[PDB]
Design a protein around this ligand. Structure first.
Ligand SMILES: Nc1nc2c(c(=O)[nH]1)N[C@@H](CNc1ccc(C(=O)N[C@@H](CCC(=O)O)C(=O)O)cc1)CN2
Length: 611
């Protein structure tokens, strides 16, 4: 494969990527007339559309490539060769052919330099960002609204991809990523083609930081960015344009310590690294005369040593900023309040269409200790997919809320699927189960892996809801086997939810429920390596609604033990979780008896505690 030959050269020498072609074409000093012969009577002006020059001025583009190759990896002249971008020139219908030609003219140059020079050259298929932003609204007036959709972007990128691959490119390069959701759509397009039609080529992914803040246009940090696109298994990852080498330095060394991939990096004008870069090039301002200076400098430099064990046993999530759950990370609070069924206010504000004030419920939860936000829009009086889509897009607007990862909560996979399309960072999916059999579970788990989300697996199968310690273990053990073995799902992306069910009901059947969850948590944490444990905590205490002090006390008493058994996270009321040591010793001991069913009349004695 090309990956072998690619990784081989990279392990020995730091490769070079060509400068931006736009600078050279600008120097060429075209005129509208010069695009071209073929068109002649085109109703839209083509001047400035560098992409069509592959057809209308091929020799010019070919010579641009040659200069760089002699002065190497060559980008295809395909930065705007999508349906979306070419609509501004009335060439929507021409995307595939433009990429095909752009890849041919580049491939002809590559091989001449390969013949004359002796060393092999590579063609990079450039996929660009388009002007559409899937994570940012066109205006602050309507923050729910979006111009393009995920599926619309996937279609376009898929078509561009076909052309490049057919045109015989050696690397697909998703570059100048202003918005990460676009890049995720591009990655989804590439996975579509590879799944059956094509043999996979290596993917290079380059972000674009705008300021000294270290953030993308879509507000995301480098660390958050790599997590959001790691599922694409890119051979190389980096940054390009917008910033010079000096401004763009400290972000690269952050990115490099967070990934096993090689590190691309091609800055701009208005530089030998310290083990920071694996591939080097230029963008706006870079000429072939620059690349020569870059080439002679990097000639004898020792390439970066990628860490092959970077965040090995961590669950990687991301909002705008990264959020990692390693073995020694403490209990992660996933905020419960943004749930139409489980919250009185939230439901009233969603059903009444007041989404702007509903964001305050998300904002306050994060301020009150919520590290992930659970979003649940399930109600018979709601259009699930749209409301999720709407609320997710609104959250993205508010930077305080958007920082954290999101937990997409629905009993309907189409709602799940809608939220994933609208989320820029890596989310938790909540949930799937074996309720409808193995094949259905696998199809849904196969789709989630494709979007690249973490995932909650409910302790539910064909028999129904798992309420016993053994039944809980059975389902999770079977599930773990299907995910890890049959699908190659990363076991660190698997959360299992043995079901936290109500106790204290006055029905002896429900008495062991808490214990079973804690016991099952132990065996699962020991049985199934990598997987983590979650649970909806407030379900435990439906029996004592009204008495909040008891509910909160129950939660704290429950957690203390659960956490000891191996509970990594939960869907909880983040502000209102007392510390185990500061809970009154009488109430603590009472709840301890209820959770562990040690006292036969534990129910009445708890409700007795009020007074
Ligand atoms: N994977 C998983 N996901 C889940 C659950 C689970 O188990 N497992 N259970 C639910 C977790 N979320 C909540 C949120 C709130 C409450 C709750 O307790 N609400 C109050 C009402 C609060 C209010 O109206 O303000 C009540 O008593 O009904 C319970 C569970 C939904 N998602």
């Amino acid at each position: 494969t090309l990956r072998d030959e690619i990784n081989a050269i990279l392990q020995k020498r730091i490769m070079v990527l060509d400068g931006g072609m736009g600078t050279m074409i600008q120097r060429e000093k075209l005129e509208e007339h010069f695009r071209g012969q073929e068109f002649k009577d085109h109703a839209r002006p083509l001047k400035g559309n560098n992409d069509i020059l592959s057809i209308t001025q091929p020799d010019v583009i070919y010579q641009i490539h040659k200069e760089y190759l002699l002065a190497d990896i060559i980008e295809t002249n395909t930065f705007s060769s999508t349906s979306i971008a070419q609509a501004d020139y009335g060439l929507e219908h021409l995307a595939y052919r433009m990429n095909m030609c752009s890849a041919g003219v580049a491939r002809k140059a590559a091989e001449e330099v390969t013949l004359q020079t002796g060393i092999k050259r590579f063609v990079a298929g450039a996929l660009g960002p388009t002007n559409k932003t899937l994570s940012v609204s066109p205006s602050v007036e309507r923050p729910d609204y979006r111009n393009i959709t995920f599926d619309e972007l996937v279609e376009a990128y898929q078509e561009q991809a076909k052309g490049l691959l057919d045109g015989g490119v050696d690397i697909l390069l998703i570059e100048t990523i202003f918005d990460t959701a676009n890049a995720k759509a591009a990655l989804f397009a590439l996975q579509n083609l590879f799944e059956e039609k094509y043999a996979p080529r290596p993917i290079f992914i380059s972000g674009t930081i705008v300021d000294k803040s270290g953030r993308t246009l879509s507000g995301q940090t480098g660390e958050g960015f790599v997590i959001s696109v790691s599922h694409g298994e890119p051979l190389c990852i980096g940054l390009n344009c917008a910033l010079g080498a000096a401004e763009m330095r400290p972000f690269i060394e952050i990115i490099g310590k967070c990934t096993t991939a090689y590190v691309l990096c091609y800055p701009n004008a208005g530089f030998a690294m310290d083990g920071l870069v694996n591939i080097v090039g230029g963008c706006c301002g870079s000429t072939p005369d620059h690349i020569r200076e870059i080439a002679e400098a990097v000639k004898n430099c020792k390439p970066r040593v990628p860490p092959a064990t970077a965040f090995e046993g961590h669950m990687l999530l991301s909002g705008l900023e990264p959020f990692r759950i390693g073995p020694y990370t403490n209990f992660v609070n996933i905020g419960e309040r943004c749930n139409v069924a489980g919250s009185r206010k939230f439901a009233k504000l969603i059903m009444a269409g007041n989404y702007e004030e509903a964001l305050c419920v998300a904002k306050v939860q994060v301020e009150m200790g919520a590290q992930v936000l659970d979003v649940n829009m399930d109600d018979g009086m709601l259009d699930g997919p749209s409301a999720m889509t709407r609320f997710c897009n609104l959250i993205a607007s508010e930077p305080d809320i958007a920082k954290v990862p999101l937990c997409i909560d629905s009993s309907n996979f189409a709602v799940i699927e809608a939220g994933l399309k609208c989320c820029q960072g890596k989310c938790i999916v909540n949930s799937i189960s074996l309720k409808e059999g193995e094949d259905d579970f696998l199809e849904k788990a196969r789709k989630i892996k494709k979007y690249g989300a973490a995932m909650v697996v409910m302790a539910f199968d064909e028999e129904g809801q798992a309420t016993e310690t053994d039944t809980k273990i059975r389902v999770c053990t079977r599930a773990y086997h299907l995910l890890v073995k049959k699908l190659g799902f990363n076991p660190n992306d698997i959360i299992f939810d043995p079901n936290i069910l109500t106790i204290g009901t006055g029905m002896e059947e429900h008495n062991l429920y808490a214990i079973n969850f804690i016991h099952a948590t132990k065996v699962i944490k020991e049985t199934l390596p990598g997987a983590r444990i979650s649970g909806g905590l407030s379900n435990l205490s439906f029996s004592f609604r009204g008495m909040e002090a008891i509910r909160e006390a129950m939660h704290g008493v429950f957690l203390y033990h659960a956490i000891k058994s191996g509970m990594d996270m939960g869907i909880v009321n983040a502000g209102n979780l007392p510390v185990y040591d500061d809970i009154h010793k009488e109430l603590l001991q009472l709840c301890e008896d209820l959770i562990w069913n040690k006292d036969p009349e534990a129910t009445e004695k708890l409700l007795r505690y009020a007074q």
